């Protein structure tokens, strides 16, 4: 069975080359259905500090079947208990029509101290 | 009737699927004419600090007739009198051919302490 959101998505972008998906509540993760075979451009806007100040490096997860072509990791250092902008971005190939994908934040290096105003935005570029 | 400026913009991107607009001086706001019916991806590169250090959250405005589909707010905390990167980004639907739109920075939470090197860049994706 397909969800209401999944059902809407296929029809919504049926005649489109670009598609946008984001999760209005929390914004740390994005789950969506690819309306067509595409390349995903995932942007994770994030603010935070490392555990007791210090280093923290973040990235985006690679769902099964996808290839993380490129990844621009987000980094922050010091400023304990104060969240600072540390956006991460990654590009994925191999997304398939009708398939559901889930992208999350991943810890690349160091430990998390606390997040603020995270927002993951997915841009899909239709193949052909 | 269409103005010379309106016509120039419309002819410039006549055979384009993507268009870019930004404001040369200041960079806090962008005013432009949509060359065709589109979806806008507004990115506001911003640096700043909250009033006397502390919390400050920024976003982008929603001009009349448009729908802010998604918004990734920018945030900063502490570091009084030192501007730190706090970019915000928002996606809009409902832009119409020949219509003029104006996007500005908006204060989502907290108070402003002072800005540095702001740059708003508009990406337009033509509707098929």
């Amino acid at each position, epitope marked *: 069975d397909v*969800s209401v959101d999944g059902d809407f998505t296929m029809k919504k972008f049926a005649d489109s080359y670009v598609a946008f998906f984001a999760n209005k*509540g929390s914004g740390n993760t994005v789950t969506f259905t690819a309306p067509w075979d595409c390349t995903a451009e995932v942007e994770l806007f994030y603010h935070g500090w490392g555990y007791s100040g210090g280093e923290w490096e973040i990235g985006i997860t690679t769902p099964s079947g996808l290839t993380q072509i490129y990844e621009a990791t987000g980094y922050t250092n010091g400023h304990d208990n104060q969240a600072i902008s540390m956006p991460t971005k990654a590009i994925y190939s191999g997304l398939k029509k009708g398939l559901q994908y889930t992208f999350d934040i991943r810890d690349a290096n160091g430990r998390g101290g606390g997040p603020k105003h995270p927002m993951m935005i997915v841009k899909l570029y239709r193949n052909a | 009737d269409v103005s010379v400026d309106g016509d120039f913009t419309m002819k410039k991107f006549a055979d384009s699927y993507v268009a870019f607009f930004a404001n040369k001086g200041s960079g806090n706001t962008v005013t432009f004419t949509a060359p065709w019916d589109c979806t806008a991806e507004v990115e506001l590169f911003y640096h700043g600090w909250g009033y006397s250090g502390g919390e400050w959250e920024i976003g982008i405005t929603t001009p009349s007739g448009l729908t802010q589909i998604y918004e990734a707010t920018g945030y900063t905390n502490g570091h009084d009198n030192q501007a730190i990167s706090m970019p915000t980004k928002a996606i809009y639907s409902g832009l119409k051919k020949g219509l003029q739109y104006t996007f500005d920075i908006r204060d989502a939470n907290g108070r402003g302490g002072g800005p540095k090197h702001p740059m708003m860049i508009v990406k337009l994706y033509r509707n098929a």
Partner: nanobody
Framework: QVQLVESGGGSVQAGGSLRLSCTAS????????MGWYHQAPGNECELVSA???????YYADSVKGRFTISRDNAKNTVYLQMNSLKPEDTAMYYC???????????????????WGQGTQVTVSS
């Protein structure tokens, strides 16, 4: 929580017209995609029509040119103007929302009263 309310359905003869209304609450309406599902007894829960955040519309091939979906973002309401009704249009009509703030239910749940209880449309020959 997310609340959907449908009204408008009733008994009518073929060729007639009905206007279904759906008022929403519990989520940012302007950013959401709204739709109408229907289920005739013995058939599956199927999307009749949908109006997206960007103003664009979808219509099922069976209702194309007869039905019109519209929205009044100010009133948080979606309308399905059903014209040139056929006996095949007889179904229980359910309103649906696609907002990223709430979890999206499987389509089958919509026609089981996941949100609203639905509005019955009955068309005679």
């Amino acid at each position: 929580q997310v609340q959907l309310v449908e009204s408008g359905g009733g008994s009518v003869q073929a060729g007639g017209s009905l206007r279904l209304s759906c008022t929403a609450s519990g989520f940012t309406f302007d950013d959401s995609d709204m739709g109408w599902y229907h289920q005739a007894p013995g058939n599956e829960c199927e999307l009749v029509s949908a109006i997206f955040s960007d103003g664009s519309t979808y219509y099922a091939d069976s209702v194309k040119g007869r039905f019109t979906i519209s929205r009044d973002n100010a009133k948080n309401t979606v309308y399905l103007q059903m014209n040139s009704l056929k006996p095949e249009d007889t179904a229980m009509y359910y309103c649906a929302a696609a907002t990223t703030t709430v979890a999206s239910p499987p389509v089958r749940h919509v026609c089981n009263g996941y949100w609203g209880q639905g509005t019955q449309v009955t068309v005679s020959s």
